[PDB]
Amino acid sequence: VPLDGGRFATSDLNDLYRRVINRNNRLKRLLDLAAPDIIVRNEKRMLQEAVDALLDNGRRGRAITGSNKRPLKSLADMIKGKQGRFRQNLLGKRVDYSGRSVITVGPYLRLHQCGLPKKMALELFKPFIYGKLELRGLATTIKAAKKMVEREEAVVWDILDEVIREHPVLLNRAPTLHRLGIQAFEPVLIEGKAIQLHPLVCAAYNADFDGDQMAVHVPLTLEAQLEARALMMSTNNILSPANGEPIIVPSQDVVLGLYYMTRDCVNAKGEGMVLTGPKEAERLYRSGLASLHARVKVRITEYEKDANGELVAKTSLKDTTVGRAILWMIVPKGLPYSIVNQALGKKAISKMLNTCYRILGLKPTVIFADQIMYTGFAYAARSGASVGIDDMVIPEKKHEIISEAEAEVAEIQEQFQSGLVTAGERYNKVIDIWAAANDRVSKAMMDNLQTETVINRDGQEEKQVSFNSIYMMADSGARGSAAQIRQLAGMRGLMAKPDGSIIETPITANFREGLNVLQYFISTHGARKGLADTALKTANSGYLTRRLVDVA
Amino acid sequence: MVYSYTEKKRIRKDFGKRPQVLDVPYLLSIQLDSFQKFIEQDPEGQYGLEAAFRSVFPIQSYSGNSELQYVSYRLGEPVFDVQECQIRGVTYSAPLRVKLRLVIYEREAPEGTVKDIKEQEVYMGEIPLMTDNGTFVINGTERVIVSQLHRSPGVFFDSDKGKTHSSGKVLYNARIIPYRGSWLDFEFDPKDNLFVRIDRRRKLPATIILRALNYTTEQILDLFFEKVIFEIRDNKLQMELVPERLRGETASFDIEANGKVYVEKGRRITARHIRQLEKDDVKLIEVPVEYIAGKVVAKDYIDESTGELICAANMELSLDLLAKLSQSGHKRIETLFTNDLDHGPYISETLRVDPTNDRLSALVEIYRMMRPGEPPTREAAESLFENLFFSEDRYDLSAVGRMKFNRSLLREEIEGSGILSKDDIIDVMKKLIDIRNGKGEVDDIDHLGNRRIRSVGEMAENQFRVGLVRVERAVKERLSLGDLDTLMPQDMINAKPISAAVKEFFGSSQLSQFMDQNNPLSEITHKRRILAAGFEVRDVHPTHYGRVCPIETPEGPNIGLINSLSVYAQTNEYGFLETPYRKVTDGVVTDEIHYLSAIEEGNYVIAQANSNLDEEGHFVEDLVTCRSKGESSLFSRDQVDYMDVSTQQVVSVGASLIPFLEHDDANRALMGANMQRQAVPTLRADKPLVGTGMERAVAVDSGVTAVAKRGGVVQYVDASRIVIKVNEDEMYPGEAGIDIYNLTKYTRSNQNTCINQMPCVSLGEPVERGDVLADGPSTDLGELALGQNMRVAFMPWNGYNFEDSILVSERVVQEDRFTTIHIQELACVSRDTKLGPEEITADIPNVGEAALSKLDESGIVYIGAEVTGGDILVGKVTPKGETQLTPEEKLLRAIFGEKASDVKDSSLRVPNGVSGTVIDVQVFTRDGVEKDKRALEIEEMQLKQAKKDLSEELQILEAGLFSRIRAVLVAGGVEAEKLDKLPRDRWLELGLTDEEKQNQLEQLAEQYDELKHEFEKKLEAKRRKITQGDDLAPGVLKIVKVYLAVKRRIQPGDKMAGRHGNKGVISKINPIEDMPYDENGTPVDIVLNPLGVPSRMNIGQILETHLGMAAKGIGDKINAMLKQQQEVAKLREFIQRAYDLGADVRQKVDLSTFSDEEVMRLAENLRKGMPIATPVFDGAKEAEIKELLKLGDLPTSGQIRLYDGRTGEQFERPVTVGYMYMLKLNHLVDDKMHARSTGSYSLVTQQPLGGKAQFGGQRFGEMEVWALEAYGAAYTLQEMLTVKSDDVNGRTKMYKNIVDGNHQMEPGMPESFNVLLKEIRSLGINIELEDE
Amino acid sequence: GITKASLATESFISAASFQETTRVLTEAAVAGKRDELRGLKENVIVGRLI
Amino acid sequence: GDDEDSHLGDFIEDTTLELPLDSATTESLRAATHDVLAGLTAREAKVLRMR
Ligand SMILES: CO[C@H]1/C=C/O[C@@]2(C)Oc3c(C)c(O)c4c(O)c(c(/C=N/N5CCN(C)CC5)c(O)c4c3C2=O)NC(=O)/C(C)=C\C=C\[C@H](C)[C@H](O)[C@@H](C)[C@@H](O)[C@@H](C)[C@H](OC(C)=O)[C@@H]1C
Ligand SMILES: [Mg+2]
């Protein structure tokens, strides 16, 4: 086939095939010319070389294509490849009716839907739109319909709402691992060029918002619509196939909301009073009378289905807080109030959803999950949680701890100068005292940070778990952990030199303070080895799945 | 010095203590210096074209005594200048004109020449030139060549312990790596047999090379082993004993001499016995006849009588052999000294495995190793072996190779032969054996003394070298048969051969790449970049300090394979990496700078960048943190030889721009310096509110801005140009002068961003040399602004900030501050087809008057006409004849009476969805085709525009010169009112009294007339360049390039990040009504999610916020006192207070500044905010920040009360609000976004392919197939890989059903598999589809 | 082992996918092996219902 | 590019094919003219189908 500028391009087989013919033809000629044996023999070998080169090149001489150094690709190389066949192997054929773009949040979505940019949906459903436009008679013929959507006439948007309504679309992320890497959603028309994705699904995809892009696929055939709705739909897979635990577990902001919601301080507005029910509990809070967390007895109606397929009801005065009272409005039916009466960390908040599923079934759990997300985001916003530089509290005893551990190293050093201890024995020892020191500082700042809220109810004092911002993050299960916190306030670790040994002079400073030149430079290897290890081990993991799916 | 003129406009408050002893050098040094060394006239073999010439020259013919030598070279003026070269698309290059001298020696000489013709400057090739900014133009596009990091030439001794054989025992191998020529490898084995292989080829016993050097066995043992002397004196075996030989051995018999028994049998010989023998000087002892049973005889031994060989060299003696050589009269027998611990018997065992015997044998066995299978020949083997390491042609180490070679061998000479000598090979072997013996150590590849840095200059020389060798063969070939005086040094030397060596490098090579220019930092951080396998080389090495940046590297498939150059690093004289240091003599820190290479720095003890010294500069503490040999520990007060120059020198330009870097984890720091290069410039260049102090240096050193050549007062200021009237002290006597800066205006960058300069100075203002005249894109008043700082609040907002997502107030998009300007280059080609030529004519079948409106009579959109998606930019139509229509189409035309044209519509139309304004049109035409109307209009416009510019030059220039004549005439003959009356042209007649002023008038006269004619010649050349038909590709008749300027603001989907590694994607654009506001009522621009801060440990982003808040305070305050119009006194007082800030900083400050005009202007620039400088590791501290917040009127906590704009109610807890600098990276959502319904299809296999820039469908992979297989979805998968893609039938049968309202699929067979069947069937394989 | 057990698959069209194509095709072609599909990999190649 | 198995031949689109968004309109235009030819007299349809 011709190209631009009048140049031609052709497969290498021609160059190969051509050769096989010539030599062959020449041999036919050389028979009728009665040539000597030494020649027809050479010609036969030449024919053999050409045929071999044609079928699979590289098993003899590796014939090279005309005027181009690169060896010409033979028929075996067309089938062959990396690995095996090109057709279904990654990758693997392009597919119509698709698209892709940067993704954003869209917290308003129900778990069964997703925000779809207007322009993308127009180009995606073009055939559906064409056929629907002339089914109702808004367009004379298919061409006139094309001109309508090409003109983007205002009337077409409503027709699109018809073809979109019940019509799931497939969403996919870049490293598809388990089956949840593709999930079906109901499309919601959205102005703007970004795809909006329900937060609760963000866990199954391992999709951050730092600019990851996602792909869309339209399920054309009827069987695909019903497969998507009855198999690949979001609401029909809420549980990891690896383990029955819910994969729809609320992620971070939502759980930070609920943690701040059901929690209690020692003295707060409305402490001790009693209310008829959750309705007037919210009325107390929203109006500004009562604080979100205060210890209060309120009448609640819980349910237990412990009868035979039948929901029993029982009412009592529960000792609780205002937030937990408000939150109860969401919990459906047959769950006992015991589940919401705790502090609701990220761990407990998952077992809540799980039990809800194993008791009331699927449908009640979904609408439950939605509500949990909405309320989590909402109340977290009311909370005004933030992170300041004064939110990271360093122990008052740190400098002293460093000094005591600093004496230890000079003691063992004095023992090595006098030969009381061998060089190797010294190293392990010094390393041990510094390590112990790290533990000492860690369990110091942890005590100070955790409980240091000291507040007054009617008396002199009392002390509860701190309301300091960063602790709530780490405590709730939202984000952060004792290891990372330790790096912020207390000293961070003892890094390791490239050969795998660990340097006997740890990083005595932390991030709230400054790191000097050396400390940072030593930190680099850990970072560099971290990034390298993950980036390589990511590929390795995939390889594992490959062998596995082949063997199964 | 003590503050410039644009420094009086705005000054950055600088925290930080450590005084800067050295200031940041030119950041582009490497790129410019290298190329500067390549092309230059150097009267010697120092690297350059001169050196590359002097290597291959002189070229003599084959035995014909016809020699061609090289005289000198020159670089002709460039064909096109830098700007013109970009538009046309050719390369920016200069002709290389080299004088050659052809001598022919009389045949059967005494050497003398029949005739010698000197061919004047034969032209070979055009070599590219580097821009003043350090870039190259290959084809119309600025490209940068990244410096490379490779293994330095020399010798290297490695280990290969562990993995081999899993027996331990290690191994020791040496490798000789020349700059050019074959590799020579030496290696041991588990049997302690020394082996050698040339390149990676078959392993061979080491000794086989020594034989090829003409060394017999006797001399091999004599070289690598010592001599144990055995004497037969009187009778039965005495022996010479060196008393040290008994260390590490146990007595094998009675060791006795001099009538006294020193050691008995079975008593190991320790230091005591050895002392006795050493001090008693025992030369000769009695040994048994059985001890030589193991000892290997050194030399050959023959029987004097029978003349037959008794025992050959390197043979183990036995008790019977001793008898056969004793009766022949042999008194002495030399044996090897062998110790399995100290001096190993390796070579001895290597000889027993050697198949060869003599030199020819080794040469045969060597030649057959390199080129096996072919019969060896003596002349062939000799030629080969001498051509490998001994030939000046095929082998060179050059200077660096020889130096490190000699250096690693503990030699004296630092420079020597560029080939290998027998002495060299022997020495290398000696060193390898010494390491195996335990004395000495092995090097490591990762050390930066073994890593050499190349760069454009060095690399181009190699390619030019390659060009000269392939031309060398030709010159000799022609000079072989040459006739005497007919040919000359032109008919021989061609152009295409040499030019193509250099052209193939810069054009396509992994090291030559498009400059990354979306951002000044991107440029300057690209031009400093390095390139180099397992984790060892990727990892950070102790030697990287001050040379390679630890934290700036890409995160991905290649980590630590790139790095970047450090701030103060410099290429060593020999090409290593050296860094600045301060010499500490006695107890004082001296400010003399000293550059130490990687190996140089090793032994010295170097102090820390952060240290406390005072007064005379004595170390305050009795011990200070230092690093000595590959490790760091506390060192005593007076030991240290040197000290770090600055606190920054460890990092790179990228990392040095992150404020409070010391507070951020290295992972996020990497990502930050990785992302900062992606910041697209903005519409309004802003300024960083929080900063480092490098931003000024990065802005200036990169050419994006326009720097003053000479100081003076601004004569004229226009948005186009700037004319400076030079001060006389800075001015040269002749021509007088003024400096005219022609500013770059709106134009396309490589990344399609806008690069536009703005004048930063005002009419008639004093400017000093080295001051910023005009800012470039993303630079403000001489600093580097990659974005715009804004008010930010940390708090979850209804989940819209969920992961990293960013929630931005409408105020931002309304202020148009994050708006970005893109310039896209669209092209229209009128080609030639066998059916006919394509026309740019404005007559297009089937288009309305509204479509053709925006086009002129010629068919090209008017300049400046705003267009949207679908508008026709260029009308184009191509012939397609005999359409061959069908019955119903024919009726259609019959009813509606349309004449279906013989031409099909190819016209260039605006891509879908993109909308902008047309800022330019170019018309390229084949030479010989008539330029159309519009094209001629353009040419006329360019002509007139050219004349105006050149005339502007001459007009301002002439006045500048005559204004000086006026001044010189008034000295010695002053007439004030009289002089300016008569016509200015008549001034040149007046002379002067005897003085230099008469000669000054002379000078100005000469240069005046020169300008008059120089203007003339410049105009002519420009005109010809306009009218000359541009050279195009084969087949293309004409090309129309349209330039659209789209202005995109910000929308959900764009990527945004701070300098601290926090990414984000704008989620919702929220109204100002719903924005959290403070009690004062001022809303907040951006709401970040706090949850991202603890997990990713970057605490600077918080500090950057806090200090930022404080900074804005000092700004806001001034904004009040300026709106109060208090007075200069009150303002002056308050500002001074700010710049001191409580104690011990390096800033100093004013009351030297003019109290009125200078002070009031400064405050006006500070009212937006108070620029603060946080040095990288010297940066401010919490206390300093809190105190500035006290002066600010703002709380120490940095948190305030905020109110939701919806309910108006308060927010529980205070939230942190402040000012964070934020960049807009270019991932912008309306690029990434693609959607396709039914597009084009690939021909070979029918599969979706974008041909229209309507993108091919999404790629559905194998992993996604598994995902469908895990679900029970069969039909989705079939439709995915059959009807939606690969089925050329199923696709159409499907589409028709979709419009009919029937959702089904009639799948058929994917064409891919259908091809595999024929491909298999094309072989001898019969593949059928069975049954039913 | 997993990588060894995956070697044996009755359907040759599947094996030609992830294994070395040349050897698979030949070794099957001599015996006149008749691939019945019945598996996943092979049915995906040919483009019919899993 | 990319060194990936993407090869020049993979980018050469098929120009001799007919896009389905068109082929659909051909099958429609047949139905169109066939409808409009039944709106005329039997001889006008015959004469026009003949011409
Ligand atoms: C001729 O060079 C090409 C390939 C050589 O082949 C090959 C095998 O040898 C390479 C060399 C020698 C590199 O030094 C290199 C590289 O330094 C780099 C990336 C990684 N690139 N990215 C790719 C895009 N992506 C979205 C982000 C990461 C590379 O892949 C390579 C690379 C190769 O792969 N990266 C960086 O340095 C960092 C972190 C920033 C880069 C700056 C900008 C981005 C680039 O300069 C752009 C403007 C162009 O210059 C490139 C497009 C070059 O292409 C051309 C024609 O100019 C490309 C290097
Ligand atoms: Mg990402």
Curated annotation (Swiss-Prot), chain A:
Note the effect listed for R486 to C/H/P/S: Resistant to antibiotics salinamide A and B
**Outcome, altering A483T:** Resistant to antibiotics salinamide A and B
Statement on biotechnological application from the UniProt entry: Co-administration of salinamide and rifampicin or salinamide and myxopyronin suppresses the emergence of resistance to both antibiotics.
Q: Is the Nucleotidyltransferase keyword given for this protein?
A: yes
Q: Where are the transmembrane segments?
A: none
Q: Does the keyword Ubl conjugation apply?
A: no
Q: What is the effect of changing P506 to S/T?
A: Resistant to antibiotics salinamide A and B
Record keywords? Acetylation, Antibiotic resistance, DNA-directed RNA polymerase, Magnesium, Metal-binding, Nucleotidyltransferase, Transcription, Transferase, Zinc
Which example biological process does GO assign this protein? cellular response to cell envelope stress
**According to its record, what are the GO cellular component terms?**
cytoplasm; cytosol; cytosolic DNA-directed RNA polymerase complex; membrane; transcription elongation factor complex
Annotated GO molecular function terms are: DNA binding; DNA-directed RNA polymerase activity; magnesium ion binding; zinc ion binding
* Lineage: superkingdom: Bacteria
The PTM entry states: Acetylated on several lysine residues in the presence of glucose.
Describe, as the record does, how this protein assembles with itself and its partners: The RNAP catalytic core consists of 2 alpha, 1 beta, 1 beta' and 1 omega subunit. When a sigma factor is associated with the core the holoenzyme is formed, which can initiate transcription. The rRNA transcription and antitermination complex (rrnTAC) consists of RNAP, NusA, NusB, NusE (rpsJ), NusG, SubB, ribosomal protein S4, DNA and precursor rRNA; S4 is more flexible than other subunits.
Q: Which family does it belong to?
A: Belongs to the RNA polymerase beta' chain family.
Descriptive protein name = DNA-directed RNA polymerase subunit beta'
Q: Which gene encodes it?
A: rpoC
Q: Which residues of the full protein are shown?
A: 253 to 804 of 1407
From Swiss-Prot, chain B:
- Print the keywords alphabetically: Acetylation, Antibiotic resistance, DNA-directed RNA polymerase, Nucleotidyltransferase, Transcription, Transferase
Identify one Pfam family in the record: RNA_pol_Rpb2_2
> What does UniProt say on post-translational modification here?
Acetylated on several lysine residues in the presence of glucose.
Catalytic activity, EC = 2.7.7.6
Q: Per the record, GO CC terms?
A: cytoplasm; cytosol; cytosolic DNA-directed RNA polymerase complex; membrane; transcription elongation factor complex
Q: What is the effect of changing D665 to A/G?
A: Resistant to antibiotics salinamide A and B
Quaternary arrangement and interactors, per the entry?
A: The RNAP catalytic core consists of 2 alpha, 1 beta, 1 beta' and 1 omega subunit. When a sigma factor is associated with the core the holoenzyme is formed, which can initiate transcription. The rRNA transcription and antitermination complex (rrnTAC) consists of RNAP, NusA, NusB, NusE (rpsJ), NusG, SubB, ribosomal protein S4, DNA and precursor rRNA; S4 is more flexible than other subunits. In pull-down experiments interacts with CedA. (Microbial infection) Interacts (via flap domain) with Escherichia phage lambda antitermination protein Q; this interaction renders bacterial RNAP resistant to transcription pausing and allows it to read through termination signals.
What name is this protein filed under?
Answer: DNA-directed RNA polymerase subunit beta
* Species lineage: Bacteria, Pseudomonadati, Pseudomonadota, Gammaproteobacteria, Enterobacterales
- Gene name for this UniProt entry: rpoB
UniProtKB/Swiss-Prot annotation, chain C:
Per the record, the domain of life is: Bacteria
The entry's comment on post-translational modification says: Acetylated on several lysine residues in the presence of glucose.
Chain segments annotated as transmembrane: none
Question: Quaternary structure per UniProt?
Answer: The RNAP catalytic core consists of 2 alpha, 1 beta, 1 beta' and 1 omega subunit. When a sigma factor is associated with the core the holoenzyme is formed, which can initiate transcription. The rRNA transcription and antitermination complex (rrnTAC) consists of RNAP, NusA, NusB, NusE (rpsJ), NusG, SubB, ribosomal protein S4, DNA and precursor rRNA; S4 is more flexible than other subunits.
Its biotechnological use is: Co-administration of salinamide and rifampicin or salinamide and myxopyronin suppresses the emergence of resistance to both antibiotics.
The gene designation is: rpoC
**Record's function text:** DNA-dependent RNA polymerase (RNAP) catalyzes the transcription of DNA into RNA using the four ribonucleoside triphosphates as substrates.
Q: What is the protein named?
A: DNA-directed RNA polymerase subunit beta'
Q: Which family does the entry's similarity section mention? A: Belongs to the RNA polymerase beta' chain family.
UniProtKB/Swiss-Prot annotation, chain D:
Site feature (Interaction with anti-sigma factors) residues: R51
Q: Which domain of life is it from?
A: Bacteria
- Entry's localization field: Cytoplasm
Assigned protein family? Belongs to the sigma-70 factor family. RpoD/SigA subfamily.
Q: Self-association or partners: how does it assemble?
A: Interacts transiently with the RNA polymerase catalytic core formed by RpoA, RpoB, RpoC and RpoZ (2 alpha, 1 beta, 1 beta' and 1 omega subunit) to form the RNA polymerase holoenzyme that can initiate transcription. Identified in a complex containing RpoD, the RNA polymerase subunits RpoA, RpoB and RpoZ, CRP and DNA. Interacts with Rsd; this prevents interaction with the RNA polymerase catalytic core and with promoter DNA, and as a consequence, promotes transcription from promoters that require alternative sigma factors.
Could you give the domain comment from the record? Contains 4 domains, connected by flexible linkers. In the active conformation, the domains are in an extended conformation, each making extensive interactions with the RNA polymerase catalytic core. In the autoinhibited state, sigma-70 factor domain-1 packs closely together with sigma-70 factor domains-2 and -4, contrary to the extended conformation that is seen when the protein is part of the RNA polymerase holoenzyme.
What name does UniProt use for this protein?
RNA polymerase sigma factor RpoD
